[PDB]
Design a protein around this ligand. Sequence first.
Ligand SMILES: Nc1ncnc2c1ncn2[C@@H]1O[C@H](COP(=O)(O)OP(=O)(O)O)[C@@H](O)[C@H]1O
Ligand SMILES: [Mg+2]
Length: 251
Amino acid sequence: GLLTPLHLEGLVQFQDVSFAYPNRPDVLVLQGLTFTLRPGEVTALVGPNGSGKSTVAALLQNLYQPTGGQLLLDGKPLPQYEHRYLHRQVAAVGQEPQVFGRSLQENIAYGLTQKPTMEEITAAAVKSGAHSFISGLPQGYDTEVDEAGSQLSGGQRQAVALARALIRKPCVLILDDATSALDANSQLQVEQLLYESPERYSRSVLLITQHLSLVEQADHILFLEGGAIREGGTHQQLMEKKGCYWAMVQA
Ligand SMILES: Nc1ncnc2c1ncn2[C@@H]1O[C@H](COP(=O)(O)OP(=O)(O)O)[C@@H](O)[C@H]1O
Ligand SMILES: [Mg+2]
């Protein structure tokens, strides 16, 4: 299939979604997940290593298909969308950023049906927390990277990957520990973009992060354990429940 609606709200619905990787079909890593991501909101996904947070992010990118249940974007199954089209609407930034052998400007504009404008490129970098280091860099945005970011540190690579995701105006944004290496100032830009930017009403967000301050501001928090959601609610509700999240916050 290949759907390409002009506008896409970014409404994500996981409906009793279960999943087992192809190479270990006998073990469900995600079990009966049901939750919704709405435009203008942020959902934080927390839990121990191996609880399935990255796997959820992988399914939302349509890298794999649910073993059970359904996952809809604007009421339609992800596969019904033209892969290129879907790849634009849904953006994911991960722990290890994908860099190219082009220039920083080309790296941020990579994968666009429309060659951007330096003003737009710069704006994406300002919001991702990349602009700053790039500016104080001899040759700035024209600077060329030696594949895999030899000259770029970890944080600089993440900030750049995030810019590439932002300049597409995704209606669905996925942050999987995408800023674990960002400096203080860039981290504030990520917070501004998630909770203060006008752009937030045009996209839903799945947030996986170690920064408990960002988590606390989330509209919804889902605690993942052994592939299943054990707790769900705002920060206060979960703190009041004094359950898994509560135990996590106060370590
Ligand atoms: N490529 C893979 N093939 C088979 N099983 C995998 C694969 N990747 C992850 N898993 C299983 O899923 C679990 C982790 O899911 P993941 O989404 O990475 O967890 P988390 O992000 O919470 O640390 C692992 O413990 C492993 O058992
Ligand atoms: Mg992970």
